[PDB]
């Protein structure tokens, strides 16, 4: 659909896996157009919102290069950060999703182990409010009802899309990424171990592109209110053991509906 | 035994766990002085220091407050995490200790299975220097030798010391760290996951901040050595479960090293 999203995705996922190191310079522009298959001026533009998003390092009368990284421009992989998105780093965001699936059973442990009725409380919670998001008559209703309205309202926004059908659909999927972040977050704070918490703290921004955008299928939303139920039943069962399989079932089954939505995909 | 690293060190770490959280109005200097058990002038002098590193905000007539961190700076946790060393952060680096403990089974199970080869040539490059860092007769000895002298001398310096016989033990101390750094650090990276990698980039400064302390003790370089050959046998023979046990002992008894060394730190 995008040459030019194909050509920006290509370069940063190559920077990413190592084949353009941090380092290095780039191939010539007219090497690096026959290599990705798109058109040259394409490119040429792609390499300078690459370098905006603070990828690359383009100066007068020199080889392109790819930037440092590592506190060298100071903030460097931040800025970049905010420029992630599922359609041009798709690679990267895959990665977070297998970490995320691989350090869950850690600090998942730790918070049913040391948090017994926090954990559940927080689990609870959010199955309700899912529970109560999913059967409502609306988004508007949803809102209506729920202790929580006030908190909803200033996390959860559209404002753009004007459809109504479409607006809706929207929330639903916004609302419903807003309580999968909330479980993830909350329970990695309870660990005891401030870093997991942490993680997702600074990963926000990013996790709520990509989840708004996976929560916008049905059955996203229908796996995930299952996998909430199986932590939940696994927390009061003190079963520890099964935690790990609860949670890489769960990583295999929502892979599986991630591939199936990566196709159509503009780039 | 140092009153002043001690009430900063109070702070941070309560800013940490979320008793000062990020928005949060500290409590007035004279209560906050009686609450940490420290001269109000030194706390004073303190919370200046703690506002110029970039964890507070002080006013002339007004309450002092914890600064934001998360994106509302925007790329914020890069500032303060500059300044964090063992003194003043202990808590901050077990933290990070823990983590790193529980999260090597996960990275270096992905690298002994699909990197069999990279990873016992890695682990064997780290333990040949390290075994060629130790024997040798001094620092210059070590560096006289060894094919990589140019690196090594571009990443391990002291030019502070001048004690000569001070100056080489902190040198042996930061050459033993960069090469415990690089067998996680490579490791990760060979995990096929660049996250884990890229983890262990962002905080190299601080570890080695950490490591060239903790590798001043003789007896954590003969540990980690031992525990290097171990991950080598693990992966030679195959057997990916044991890892997680190899790895929990080696954090087990590096743990009781680093809490007699933790026994005369100032704070
Ligand atoms: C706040 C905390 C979290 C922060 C985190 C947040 C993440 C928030 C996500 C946002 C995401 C957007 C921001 C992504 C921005 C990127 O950074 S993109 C990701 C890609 N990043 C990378 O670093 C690429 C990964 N790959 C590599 O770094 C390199 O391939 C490696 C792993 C360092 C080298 O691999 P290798 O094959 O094993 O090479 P190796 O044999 O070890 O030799 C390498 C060097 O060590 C030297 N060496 C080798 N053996 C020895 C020895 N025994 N002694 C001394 N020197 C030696 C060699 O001489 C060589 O020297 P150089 O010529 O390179 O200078
Ligand atoms: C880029 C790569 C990453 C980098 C990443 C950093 C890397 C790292 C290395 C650096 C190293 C330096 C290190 C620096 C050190 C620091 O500068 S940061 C130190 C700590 N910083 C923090 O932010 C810790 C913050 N902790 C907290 O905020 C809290 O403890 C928790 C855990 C999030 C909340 O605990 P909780 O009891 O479960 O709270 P909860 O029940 O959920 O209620 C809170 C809100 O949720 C709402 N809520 C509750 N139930 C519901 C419901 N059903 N529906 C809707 N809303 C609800 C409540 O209404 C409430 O609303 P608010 O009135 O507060 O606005
Ligand atoms: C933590 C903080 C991060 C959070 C950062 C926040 C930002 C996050 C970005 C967006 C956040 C949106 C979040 C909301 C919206 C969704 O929730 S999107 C949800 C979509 N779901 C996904 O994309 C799936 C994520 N990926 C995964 O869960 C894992 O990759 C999978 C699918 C479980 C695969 O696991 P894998 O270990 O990576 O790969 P695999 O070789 O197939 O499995 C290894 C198996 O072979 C064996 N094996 C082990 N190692 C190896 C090896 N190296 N080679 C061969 N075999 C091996 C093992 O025995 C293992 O079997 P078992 O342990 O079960 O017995
Ligand atoms: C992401 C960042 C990556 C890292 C990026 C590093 C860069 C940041 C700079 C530093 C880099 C310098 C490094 C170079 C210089 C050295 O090499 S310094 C090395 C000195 N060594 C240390 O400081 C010790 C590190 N700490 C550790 O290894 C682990 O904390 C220990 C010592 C194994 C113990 O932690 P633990 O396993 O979590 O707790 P533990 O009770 O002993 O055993 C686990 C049990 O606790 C229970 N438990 C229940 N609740 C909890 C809970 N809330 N917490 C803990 N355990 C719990 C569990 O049920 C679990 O059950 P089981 O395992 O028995 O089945």
Redesign the pocket.
Known sequence: KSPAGFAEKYIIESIWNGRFPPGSILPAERELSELIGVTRTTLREVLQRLARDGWLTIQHGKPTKVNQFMETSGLHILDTLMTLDVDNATNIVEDLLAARTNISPIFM???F???KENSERTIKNVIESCEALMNAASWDDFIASSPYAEKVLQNVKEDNEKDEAKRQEILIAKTFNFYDYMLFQRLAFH???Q??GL?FNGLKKLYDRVGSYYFSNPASRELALKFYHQLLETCESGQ?EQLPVVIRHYGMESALIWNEMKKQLPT
Chains 1, 2 share one sequence.
């Open positions: 442990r730790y918070a182990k040391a948090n660990s005891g171990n870093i997991y993680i520890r």
